[PDB]
């Protein structure tokens, strides 16, 4: 049979999800329960997977397909038919996949990189122009950078999020909506007077996001166009199979999904990577050397990012220890036995604990908690399906190369232009908005006096 956590009667496991940090609670639960453990809530059942040998079967394209998590279903209201939230047996997913995949490529990455620099320059100039006494809120400023990067590159819109003291209205509203998604999963009873207040708020926040997208289409509508871009590939992009462009109503959904999924994950990754680089001096020294040798010219070139090897290794290791996308869910496409020990009826839902998967001691050695980028010196040596932070198969992050390209480029310039000091020996605190980010992580960054 299949182990499961403590069920309080009617609500079963569901009351456990109330905590600020659900994914970490599930990791604790997985440490004790074992490879797999069942997780049943009233009206929904899902089995969490933590051992790699089960992950490799769950990941097979001809064995299990992607299922929408309970929270992702609520995410649909602003995101919807966007690939991250669209179904695999969904029409719009296939159309959008085929026509937005060419917008991510080597030629594409070249298209986006020159504009990425601009936003990273805004970040570097902000940190260079800070006074000596001031300190930097890494996750906040990383979200600040990532929004502007994705906006300017993939939608020709400058959020100008750096010119704002407080988080952008988009950030506030997005985080708040994710709040309801998670917090309504954990909720026992769907209807109650009080929730109406909440409900009100969540109509409000969403609108802001909607309103913001209205600018991108309107702005580009009024200003000059015909400059190859994601938003172009959405307006004028056409489906090879059906010869059809995207639905305007669906184009806006694409914009929502891309704006949201392009910063939170990348910004959490940058914060986590900087944190781990701060806790270990030597792993920084190596990367500070790499960025200097690889990037000579003041502005990084499209080729210079790919030339950076150690930066990508650092990013992959930091992404291993704390994958910014905490989990993905999968349903069985036909009756199978998982591991040869657990029989599952078709359509059964299994969630996958990516951070617990990376902590499997058998594959990654008996010092998994140890953060050493050198593990990724020969990334070929890593076993199959043991390391899947970006997802699996066709369903895995069309712009993952953009994630790595922006994050590597930015981090290379950060280590190039700055010296990082940790004034609090920061206690690692992970805030969850369906995504993992350090909370309270503050460092100072002295200038290195490098141009542009
Ligand atoms: C860090 C970086 C990063 C991580 C950890 C990441 C994680 C994921 C994971 C996991 C999935 C699959 C979810 C599931 O349930 O199967 C996924 C799918 C997706 N992701 Mn991303 N993703 C990005 C960067 C990331 N993504 C960026 C950047 C973009 C946008 C430019 C993006 C846009 C998507 C889209 C779109 C999908 C949907 C793919 C599909 O369903 O066909 N992404």
3-state secondary structure 31-81: HHHCCEEEEEECCEEEEEECCHHHHHHHHCCCCEEECCCHHHHHHCCCCCC
- Cα–Cα distances (Å) from 335 to 1, 43, 225, 343, 348, in that order, read 17, 21, 50, 8, 9
Which helix or strand (DSSP H or E) is residue 331 part of?
strand 327-332
Which helix or strand (DSSP H or E) is residue 268 part of?
helix 248-279
- Show the tokens assigned to 335: 């009756």
Instruction: Please tell me if the CB atom of residue 404 comes closer than 6 angstroms to any atom of ligand 1.
Output: no
| Distance from residue 261's CA to the centre of ligand 1 (Å) | 6
* CATH number, residue 266: 1.10.630.10
Instruction: Please tell me if the CB atom of residue 80 comes closer than 6 angstroms to any atom of ligand 1.
Output: no
- Show the tokens assigned to 410: 């930015």
Q: What is the DSSP letter of 384?
A: T
Residue whose CB lies within 8 A of the most ligand 1 atoms, among 350, 400, 405, 435, for a mutation test: 400
The Cα 321–Cα 89 span in angstroms is 32
Q: What is the resolution of this structure in A?
A: 3.4
Catalytic residue among 149, 265, 336, 435: 265
Which residues, 6+ apart, have CB-to-CB distance to 312 below 8 Å? Answer: 376, 404, 408
What letters, b where the CB count within 10 A reaches 16 and e where it falls short, cover 126-165?
ebbeeeeeeebebbbbbbbbbbbbbbbbbbbbbbebbeee
CA angle in degrees (0–180, nearest 5) for 443-354-341:
160
Domain that holds residue 268: 1-452
- Show the tokens assigned to 99: 């026509």
The Cα 298–Cα 292 span in angstroms is 10
Residue found by looking up tokens 């909370």 in the block: 439
Experimental method: X-ray
- Show the tokens assigned to 341: 């020990």
Residue found by looking up tokens 């009206």 in the block: 43
The Cα 164–Cα 436 span in angstroms is 23
Given phi > 0 = left and psi -120 to 50 = alpha, else beta, which region is 346?
beta
Please give the radius of gyration of the chain, using alpha carbons only, rounded to the nearest integer: 22
Q: What is the DSSP letter of 347?
A: T
The Cα 119–Cα 160 span in angstroms is 9
Please state the separation of Cα 291 from the chain's center in Å: 24
Which residues, 6+ apart, have CB-to-CB distance to 21 below 8 Å? Answer: 430, 431, 432
Number of independent structural domains in the chain: 1
* 84 part of the active site: no
Decide: 322 and 272 in contact? Cβ < 8 Å.
yes
Strand duo 44-49 + 349-353: pairing:
parallel
The Cα 112–Cα 403 span in angstroms is 12
């Amino acid at each position: 049979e299949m182990p499961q956590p403590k069920t309080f009667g009617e609500l079963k496991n569901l009351p456990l999800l109330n905590t600020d940090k659900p994914v970490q609670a599930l990791m604790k639960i997985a440490d004790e329960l074992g490879e797999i453990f069942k997780f049943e809530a009233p009206g929904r059942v899902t089995r969490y997977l933590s051992s790699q040998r089960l992950i490799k079967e769950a990941c097979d394209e001809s064995r299990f397909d992607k299922n929408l998590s309970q929270a992702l279903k609520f995410v649909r209201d602003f995101a919807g038919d966007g690939l991250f939230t669209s179904w695999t047996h969904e029409k719009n997913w296939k159309k959008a996949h085929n026509i937005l995949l060419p917008s991510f490529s080597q030629q594409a990455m070249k298209g986006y990189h020159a504009m990425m620099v601009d936003i990273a320059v805004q970040l570097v100039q902000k940190w260079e122009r800070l006074n000596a006494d001031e300190h930097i809120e890494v996750p906040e400023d990383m979200t600040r950078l990532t929004l502007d990067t994705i906006g300017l590159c993939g939608f020709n819109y400058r959020f100008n999020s750096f010119y704002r003291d407080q988080p952008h209205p988009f950030i506030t509203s997005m985080v708040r909506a994710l709040d309801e998604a998670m917090n309504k999963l954990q909720r026992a009873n769907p209807d109650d007077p009080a929730y109406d207040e909440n409900k009100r708020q969540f109509q409000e926040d969403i609108k802001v996001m909607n309103d913001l997208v209205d600018k991108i289409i309107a702005d580009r509508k009024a200003s000059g166009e015909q400059s190859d871009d994601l938003l172009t590939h959405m307006l004028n992009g056409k489906d090879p199979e059906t010869g059809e462009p995207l639905d305007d109503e669906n184009i806006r959904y694409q914009i929502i999904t891309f704006l949201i999924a392009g910063h939170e994950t990348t910004s959490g990754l940058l914060s986590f990577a900087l944190y781990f680089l701060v806790k270990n001096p030597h792993v920084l020294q190596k990367a500070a050397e790499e960025a200097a040798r690889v990037l000579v010219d003041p502005v990084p070139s499209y080729k210079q990012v790919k030339q950076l090897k150690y930066v990508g290794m650092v990013l992959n290791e930091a992404l291993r220890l704390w994958p910014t996308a905490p989990a993905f869910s999968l349903y069985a496409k036909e009756d199978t036995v998982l591991g040869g020990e657990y029989p599952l009826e078709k359509g059964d839902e299994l969630m996958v604990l990516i951070p617990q998967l990376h902590r499997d001691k058998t594959i990654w050695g008996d010092d998994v908690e140890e953060f050493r980028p050198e593990r990724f010196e020969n990334p070929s040596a890593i076993p199959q399906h043991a390391f899947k932070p970006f997802g699996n198969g066709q369903r895995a992050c069309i712009g993952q190369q953009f994630a790595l390209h922006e994050a590597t480029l930015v981090l290379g310039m950060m280590l190039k232009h700055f010296d990082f000091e940790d004034h609090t020996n920061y206690e690692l605190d992970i805030k969850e908005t369906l995504t993992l980010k350090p909370e309270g992580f503050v460092v100072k960054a002295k200038s290195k006096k490098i141009p542009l």
